[PDB]
């Protein structure tokens, strides 16, 4: 409201160029081309009417594409997890038993994926829903490298998620994931990215989650007027850099990816979901997957599958590595800052 | 300047353009001979010693 | 940005009503241009091409979504430009497949089954806005259909997406509509597998290059070699010259059968699954 | 303008002669391989001395192999103090349309994807050299994708002759030839390994059914002029039927639930049609002239709309 650091205070208002650009156009002149040569409220609500006029007398500011979905609360819990997590949409699981009959190699149990998925519906009930990312880490927790922080993921899920026997949801869905790779229906063929959390609506057995399917993060008016701010949080088992592991320490915008690792063995099949931060082209990424993860190459068609997730627009991108609280549980959480979401498609194996 | 023609449609390309043209002078000269004997110089001059 | 396609005069009552029906339907146009004739859009502008000719055409032409239809001109926003300008433009399903939220959607030529205008004396065929995981499948099933007619299964004609059943049979006209792709998908493989087979025993160039190749060929490629070279053989054979001829041809078919997504559906305050015949909010911009 | 444009600003130093500085004013529609997406860079990170490794600047076939490790960007305007380029991948402009410039000898068309290739052609390797700074700028060549796959194909085939003419092309009746050049063997090894792994994985058990159909094609090429033109005069399969009698096995392992040819196509598409994208870089650019013409000639600009 017109302060006196004016040249910045007018600069934050959306300039002098728009005044000078309308000066030669509109402020001067008749040229373009011419001839030659009622005590407490009202005025409380009355200035609120004027606030609508203040909303109408005027109106950078980035854009979004907010999305909503009516979502069952079996697998994910938008109440237990705070605003600012990853989310994952799914295909409808009636396509699961038929595609396993044609994509699984000969000699493998194609009945296994339809049976393992059916046991999950009777275990979370003691309809294409949504998988939250923290729930997915405890499922693939039995394949990682840092196993203690994967148990820190498992420490809060069994105590904060709504439902009965959340550990039985975990150990059955992890059995579903071991039935995914065995029936060759890869989880990247099912897991689809759905935007980062901003808010949700509570209801019995289902929740209406809002999310940004494309755009930046922190300037969404969350609904809370004190804090329209919510940082992106990732557990420490999934956060993988390629600036430190490849000695690329230069500044530049850092991309964010999702990466699946596949190990194809007889009834011992591993799954690991990683969030890869990089300064690389997405076409200049598959060679970097060859250098690191050649161990799952031999034990297996590719072992890797990946897609874009978002971009950090910072010159020197800033990350945090803290221990936050999901209720009473201290989890080592990699908090990311300033993320501009742009999704993409997965990449192939067979 | 380079002249411009406005067009509609999604504007693929254009921007106003100047030019700086500079061209080199060529020195030349003209020569005209002229002569006098001494017969007339005294006359035009004045008195003698 | 929103272009214009003027309807030429002489329209009957249903021919204006049929164009009133196709509100949110996809249209290919040659260039982004303000003024444009309706004969440029119609099926007569393509001549009748096969499935191969339409896919080469649908790469070169520019797709546009018809917005609100005026009685005099068809207004259509181009996908590549005005949709990056405008916020969100609706799009009607003409597919039998119901779209979910977040599905990248490409287009397919109408191989399945087509508004004809009699007073203007032209046909209008339209692309089918179906999702990209299905899009590479429905083509590959039909390419596998045409090979068996060159000598099938009781399955392979039935597709499942999102609890919905399809039938690709639902025919011989379609098989001759697709015969040129079969003559290219067969030849690009038979040229391909021979150049693999006539080079690895020809060179196996050694040190770690052939050894890592043989580690990959340990009863996997060499067993596939010895199984194929059993019903095969082993002057100058133009081996090196045929690789350029093969990478140009087989590299071309990857472009044609790519089927890139343009539509990305981000529904907001709406159904996460959009049914058949309904309109869907569509963006191609972040 | 962070998402719409992205003004990556190449700074220009102080000491540049006015003949060298005015040589950059003709560098309008170009391609600059940004290593990162920093908002402030220098010419030394852009020029070829950034591209060189320890002691070794690679050949043209290797000059592809670190383009795809970088970020191509197009110069928008050459100011006296800086050069501004928007990266192709992030965001093109406000409206999303940037102009290139045909340094090709080849005329373009509308709607065709445009691949950018190192300067391989003869009489074409024109690198704008900074004499005031000792810097060279190897400007790549925007080309049509029906050429840009063959041009990579002639180079890869030339290196494998050199492990035991070819450098002549044609395009729309225009004869043209590229520079014959000796190739470093280290560059050829990653190329040849990239062929075979996409060739071995492209073979499936159902492809043996397709192999049986080879004498049907020569039975068909005697009647259809379309098939008679399709194979080639110098095709392999025309020679690979007179010495080869293919056959299929009788039964398949679990051949009731799985599809033999449908699995043959998907493994073929994922490796063989995908293979041209792995050799070169991806043509993320096509040309949509709004009102100009249908054919964009050499030396002229061309509007660009991004390409999925």
From Swiss-Prot, chain C:
Query: What keyword terms does UniProt attach to this protein?
Result: Capsid protein, Host nucleus, Virion
GO CC, one annotated term? host cell nucleus
Read off the Pfam families from this record. Answer: Herpes_V23
The GO terms describing molecular function are: structural molecule activity
- Name the domain of life this protein comes from: Viruses
Subcellular locations according to the entry:
Virion; Host nucleus
Q: Which InterPro entries match?
A: Herpes_capsid_2
Instruction: Extract the HAMAP family matched here.
Output: HSV_TRX2
**Job description of the protein:** Structural component of the T=16 icosahedral capsid. The capsid is composed of pentamers and hexamers of major capsid protein/MCP, which are linked together by heterotrimers called triplexes. These triplexes are formed by a single molecule of triplex protein 1/TRX1 and two copies of triplex protein 2/TRX2. Additionally, TRX1 is required for efficient transport of TRX2 to the nucleus, which is the site of capsid assembly.
Family assignment? Belongs to the herpesviridae TRX2 protein family.
Task: State the oligomer form and interacting partners.
Answer: Interacts with TRX1 and major capisd protein/MCP.
Task: Tell me what this protein is called.
Answer: Triplex capsid protein 2
Q: Which gene encodes it?
A: TRX2
């Amino acid at each position: 409201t017109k302060p006196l650091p004016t040249a910045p205070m007018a600069w934050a208002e959306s300039s002098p160029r728009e005044l000078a650009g309308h000066a030669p156009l509109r402020r001067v002149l008749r040229p373009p081309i011419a001839r030659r040569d009622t005590r407490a409220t009202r005025d409380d609500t009355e200035q609120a009417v004027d606030k609508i006029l203040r909303g109408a007398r005027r109106a950078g500011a980035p854009r979004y594409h907010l999305t909503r979905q009516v979502t069952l609360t079996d697998l994910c819990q938008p109440n237990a997890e705070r605003a600012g997590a990853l989310l994952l949409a799914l295909r409808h699981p009636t396509d699961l038993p038929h595609l396993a009959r044609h994509r699984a190699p000969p000699g493998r149990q194609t009945e296994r994926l339809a049976e393992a998925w059916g046991q999950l519906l009777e275990a979370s009930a003691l309809r294409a829903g949504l998988v939250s990312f923290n729930f997915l880490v405890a499922a693939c927790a039995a394949a990682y490298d840092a196993r203690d922080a994967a148990e820190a993921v498992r420490a809060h899920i069994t105590t904060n998620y709504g439902g009965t026997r959340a550990g039985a949801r975990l150990d059955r869905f992890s059995e579903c994931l071991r039935a995914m790779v065995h029936t060759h229906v890869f989880p990247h063929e099912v897991m689809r990215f759905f935007g980062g959390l901003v808010s949700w609506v509570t209801q019995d057995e289902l929740a209406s989650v809002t999310a940004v399917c494309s755009g930046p993060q922190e300037a969404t008016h969350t609904g809370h007027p004190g804090r329209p701010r919510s940082a992106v949080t990732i557990p420490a088992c999934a956060f993988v850099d390629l600036d430190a592991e490849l000695c690329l320490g230069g500044p530049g915008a850092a991309f964010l990816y999702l990466v699946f690792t596949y190990r194809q063995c007889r009834d011992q099949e591993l799954c690991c979901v990683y969030v890869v931060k990089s300064q690389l082209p997405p076409r200049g990424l598959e060679a970097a997957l060859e250098r690191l993860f050649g161990r799952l190459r031999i034990t297996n068609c590719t072992y890797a599958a990946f897609a874009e997730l978002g971009v950090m627009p910072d010159d020197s991108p800033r990350c945090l590595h803290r221990t936050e609280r999901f209720g009473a549980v201290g989890v080592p959480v990699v908090i990311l800052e300033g993320v501009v979401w742009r999704p993409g498609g997965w990449r192939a194996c067979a | 300047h380079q002249p411009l023609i406005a067009r509609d449609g999604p504007h693929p390309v254009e921007q106003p353009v100047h030019n700086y043209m500079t061209k080199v002078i060529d020195r030349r000269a003209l020569n005209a001979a002229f002569s006098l004997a001494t017969e007339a110089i005294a006359l035009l001059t004045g008195e003698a010693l | 940005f929103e272009a214009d396609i003027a309807i030429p005069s002489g329209i009957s009552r249903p021919d204006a009503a049929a164009l009133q029906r196709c509100e949110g339907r996809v249209v290919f146009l040659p260039t982004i241009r303000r003024q444009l004739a309706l004969a440029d859009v119609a099926h007569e502008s393509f001549v009748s091409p096969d499935t191969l000719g339409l896919l080469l055409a649908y790469r070169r032409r520019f797709p546009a979504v018809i917005t609100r239809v005026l009685p005099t001109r068809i207004v259509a926003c181009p996908v590549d430009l005005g949709l990056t300008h405008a916020g969100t433009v609706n799009l009607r399903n003409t597919s039998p497949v119901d779209l979910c939220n977040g599905d990248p959607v490409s287009l397919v030529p109408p191989v399945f089954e087509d508004v004809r205008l009699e007073s203007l004396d032209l046909t209008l065929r339209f692309p089918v806005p179906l999702p990209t995981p299905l899009a590479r499948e429905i083509v590959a099933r039909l390419v596998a259909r045409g090979i068996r007619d060159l000598n099938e299964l009781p399955d392979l004609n039935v597709l499942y997406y999102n609890g919905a059943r399809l039938s690709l049979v639902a025919l011989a006209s379609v098989n001759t509509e697709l015969r040129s792709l079969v003559l290219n998908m067969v030849y690009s493989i038979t040229e391909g597998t021979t150049l693999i087979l006539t080079l690895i025993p020809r060179l196996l160039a050694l040190g770690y290059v052939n050894a890592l190749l043989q580690m990959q060929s340990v009863t996997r490629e060499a067993a596939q070699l010895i199984h194929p070279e059993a019903p095969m053989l082993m002057r100058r054979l133009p081996l090196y010259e045929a690789l350029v001829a093969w990478l140009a041809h087989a590299g071309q078919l990857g472009d044609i059968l790519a089927l890139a997504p343009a539509v990305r559906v981000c529904t907001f305050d709406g159904a996460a699954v959009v049914q058949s015949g309904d309109m869907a909010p569509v963006i191609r911009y972040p």
